[PDB]
Design a protein around this ligand. Structure first.
Ligand code: M4O
Ligand code: M4O
Lengths: 174, 174
């Protein structure tokens, strides 16, 4: 699994943008933790990309308040150590996307039989829909809600200004 | 400080080899933790490069048995997530090397006024001597033991087969 790394410079804007719009809209500006996100979400998760990266660096996967804090501290240090593009790179190569695919390149091959850099806008959006719950939104056997969440990602991209109305209309119909 | 990243492919073999020979000779083969190293060292530290990377990912810097273990668990997971060349890359860009220099490129500029890829064998060895204690072996004000430890690094490189006898003799005299 730990074989399929791809540098950020070879990952299309649509893929990077789809993940940002869906999981952490303020990714490029916060310091590893986002209060405005937590509050507005306290009303929907509030964890940043950095926090997810940190969470997946642990060996055992428990969800106690105790380690949520440890994950937040780790996230802040990482943010102090590596830049945004690097954190995004590590994250996009480690993320479990279902069907035994860890990372965007492996996911691209498993779900579309191609390299991440050959992905279309609608294909990029499908990958960004999986992190929430890979097995729950897996196209290979829950194509109904996979398509629904994909269109929801495209909607988030449209709202954030990452794609045009024209592009949106074409993608949701693919 | 978090501004001066350089990909592994632009870091000279001598630099990578100098760090491996000095800090973790079996780096390329272990799984994040090295028993043979710990035992043989129990007789000299026994922590791997991966463990040092993990140690520096924490925010606060305490040295209790409690977190040494947490660092070992983190190291094992990292090893499962990213490959050797990537772990080496992250490590060589994060390592504090004294005089406010974090990473090999920043160190190269501060100590030699040049890019890491323009470093000679004797210059690479000096950087590998700092991690043990940057302020204790700093050339800028403890050139005596900096030179001593540099020559000790070159000796380790010679022993590991990373440099030739000819190269060794030339470097220790620089
Ligand atoms: C169902 C599914 O899709 N599972 C796969 C999983 O998919 C993960 C998926 O990998 C994981 N994503 C990342 C990036 O880590 C995802 O996280 C979500 C999940 O996170 P999590 O459960 O860790 O709780 C975190 C929460 O702290 C909460 C704690 C607090 C103390 C609150 C904090 C307080 C505040 C005020 C903030 C928080 O504040 O965010 O919920 C968040 C939330 N509610 O806000 C979330 C929506 O923001 C979050 O999404 C992201 N992107 O971070 O959760 C899903 C599944 O959650 C499942 O929820 C079920 C009931 O709700 C539980 O029973 C499950 O145990 C739990 O896993 O990814 C794993 C890597 C897979 O593991 C593999 O499974 C394979 C297989 N069979 O498919 C093989 O067995 C293989 O060997 C094995 O390694 C799993 O099979
Ligand atoms: C003296 C010096 O050079 N200090 C700078 C430091 O330099 C670090 C340096 O950054 C650090 N290297 C890395 C990669 O993290 C270095 O680690 C060594 C050190 O590690 P550590 O103290 O964390 O103990 C780890 C130990 O767990 C031990 C625990 C157990 C429970 C045992 C486990 C049991 C087993 C059976 C294994 C183990 O098993 O390895 O000793 C190891 C050992 N004895 O085996 C070692 C030789 O293997 C190890 O070397 C490496 N490469 O991992 O230690 C030196 C200094 O150690 C100092 O030792 C003194 C007395 O011996 C203590 O009083 C000091 O507190 C301690 O730091 O790096 C920091 C980043 C600098 O911080 C900056 O300072 C600046 C400044 N003023 O210069 C500014 O203030 C700035 O704002 C601030 O951020 C520091 O200024």
């Amino acid at each position: 699994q730990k074989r399929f790394y791809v540098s950020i410079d070879k990952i299309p804007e649509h893929v990077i943008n789809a993940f940002v719009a869906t999981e952490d809209r303020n990714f490029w500006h916060h310091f590893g933790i986002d209060p405005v996100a937590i509050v507005r979400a306290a009303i929907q998760g509030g964890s940043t990309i950095t926090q997810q990266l940190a969470k997946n660096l642990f060996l055992t996967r428990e969800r106690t308040l105790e380690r949520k804090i440890k994950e937040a501290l780790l996230a802040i240090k990482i943010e102090r150590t590596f830049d945004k593009k690097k954190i995004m790179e590590l994250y996009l190569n480690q993320i479990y996307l279902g069907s035994g695919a860890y990372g965007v390149e492996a996911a691209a091959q498993v779900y579309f039989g191609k390299h991440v850099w050959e992905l279309s806008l609608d294909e990029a959006a499908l990958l960004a829909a999986l992190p929430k719950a890979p097995a729950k939104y897996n196209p290979f056997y829950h194509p109904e809600r996979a398509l629904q969440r994909r269109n929801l990602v495209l909607k988030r991209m449209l709202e954030e200004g990452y794609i045009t109305p024209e592009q949106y209309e074409e993608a949701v119909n693919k």
